[PDB]
Amino acid sequence: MNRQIVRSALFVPATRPERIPKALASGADRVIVDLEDAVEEGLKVEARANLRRFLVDTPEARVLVRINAAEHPGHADDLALCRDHAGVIGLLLPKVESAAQVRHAAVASGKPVWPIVESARGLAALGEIAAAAGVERLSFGSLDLALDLDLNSGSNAAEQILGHARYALLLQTRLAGLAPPLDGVYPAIQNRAGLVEAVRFARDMGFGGLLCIHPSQVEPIHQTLMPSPAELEWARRVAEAFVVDGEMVDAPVLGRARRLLERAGEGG
Amino acid sequence: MNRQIVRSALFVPATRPERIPKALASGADRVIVDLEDAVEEGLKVEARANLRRFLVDTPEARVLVRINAAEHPGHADDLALCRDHAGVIGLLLPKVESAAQVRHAAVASGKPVWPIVESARGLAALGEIAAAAGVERLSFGSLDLALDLDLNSGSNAAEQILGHARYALLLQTRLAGLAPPLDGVYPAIQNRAGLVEAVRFARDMGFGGLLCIHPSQVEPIHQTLMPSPAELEWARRVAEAGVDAPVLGRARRLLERAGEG
Amino acid sequence: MNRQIVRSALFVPATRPERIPKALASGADRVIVDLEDAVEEGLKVEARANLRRFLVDTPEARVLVRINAAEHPGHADDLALCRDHAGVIGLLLPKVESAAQVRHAAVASGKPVWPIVESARGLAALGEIAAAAGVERLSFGSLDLALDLDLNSGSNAAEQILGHARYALLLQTRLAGLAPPLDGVYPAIQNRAGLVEAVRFARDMGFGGLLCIHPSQVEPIHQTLMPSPAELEWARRVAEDAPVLGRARRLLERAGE
Description:
The structure is a homotrimer.
Chain A (H helix, E strand, L loop, with lengths): L7 E6 L5 H7 L4 E5 L9 H14 L5 E4 L8 H10 L3 E6 L5 H11 L3 E5 L2 H5 L1 H5 L8 E2 L1 H7 L7 H21 L5 E2 L8 H13 L4 E4 L5 H8 L3 H12 L10 H13 L5
Parallel strand pairs in A: 1-2, 1-8, 2-3, 3-4, 4-5, 5-6, 7-8
């Protein structure tokens, strides 16, 4: 919901509507139907129609939508689509650089916004962005930010620089009282070992999950985020409950126990 | 005093005043009597009484006091204890989240304040906190910060995040012209090798010392901060002569790190 | 060029004017004649004259000049030297701490300014510094910053802190639209392996090049920055999107074209 951990948010282009149910069947916590960078300019109207048809034909489906930003002439149409279909439970706003951009998207759609930091200018304004009314949680465009800062993506030095963006997302999350952020996409679909390392690092620094681009990435993300059997056995008992193994059942312990349950996908 | 290196600041819970003597004789640069985290809510009123009894009974003792946070009902009573006893030479303000909290504590106690940065809010306001009137030096609550940001304490990623926080504390120390800061408590009392690593890393990035939780940690901390014989020879000469401001200042820093401030 | 990659900027002390021609033939992208730290206080006036005579005697020479900081009594004379010689194509301003220091140097010299961030104060005011009129690009004074922050130079902890400071230069470069910055001097002239690693790390985080202190450092810097065969192929084609043109140009400049 607007406060649980999202372990995985899987992109699927609106140009491939047959892949939308496949994305939903992958077990990803959230599916993001993309109308933005994965859809060539000449196919945006067709893509929007494809998404409309999916939502009308599958009313129980729940998805996020990555819309075109305000500079694009289809921004209003994208927002209207988000506004008019109950199945759209939030939208990703790319290239976010101001609080105003967020508010416009949140009010026009009436839906929660996930600002995606993709530039240095967005990072510099993250304080105001994160504090904007309508923001659910933050994420960032790892590749896009690397390009904006002329980094050699994948290098240790680039990761050190991206660490600043990560720190900012984590700090602003806490300051603004947002839901757990998502780490950026790990693009090497064939490198399962590398994905696991990326997930471990994100988890260890307080991210709830990762943005992802192929159904095959879901299993390893979920596996790496999963707490131990012992932590879950304890967490479940603490959730129900009070003295549970010694400590009291206070907000810090429920927040702890309930965070374990959400990392295991046993929230709500 | 308000400018020297403090290599070690050892905590002793106010519920255990019988342990204060050992702390004061451990060689620790400062002893901190704690009224906060190490004292259960139900025993805070009592713990405050124990400290007050220790101060009156031991008028020569010199200690720091870690008071309860600003939003705690006992904050005023903690500040009154710090104000009324000459043996209290400063107070640690936990969970500092604004310059305004520092000012209230500084004016009410009339004693130097040591803000402990241990929350995101604290980091966000570190510029104004460090520059507030009454601040002696900053300290880092690494474990509390880790909890506040949901970090996996001890992991490589967590250490990267804590690096961002340490950088803020060190940069603001310099900008605000504060005395050398203290790095966080290393909790593994039975892991000397771990402690030594934590001290050397802290020292290498400009920290003056570490907060500590058991007398046995004082010796390894002091040993790891002790400058080499070479540094001390050179330092004692530059001191006797007192060569520009920064250079002479570094000579003193070496002498203080050797406990010859 | 005021917006190209500078792969290497080689320091030569003004007390050694005879070494300037060697530095200018080393292949270094820029030569920096130093009037600051490499010159003892008692020789600064003599050194300034050495440079002036060198510039008068050698009009085709193109150099940067590292002047004395704003608070040094010779700051005005150093600036006048930069103003009066057409061969001075820019100046390095040490221990920059305000936009006002940059504007003073830029107006008094009429030349581009290269602020050197070497103090906590400079870091704190970097947004204003980077945005000041006359700034070409930023450079990092890692050894002087390590002194200002009481770091143990060369240690892991010190490099972690320095990394945080490097980020500020990289971020402000992008926000202020400056030319590619230069990373700090790698002091171990005899450790070629360590130099190569320092250059690779710098390049990977977005630095255009390194400040250097010996001509033997130039070749390894240029070789480490040299893109692969495929990267240039693509770069040469795109030469013969606006941000893509920027990346293509960056590649060619890293290859010395």
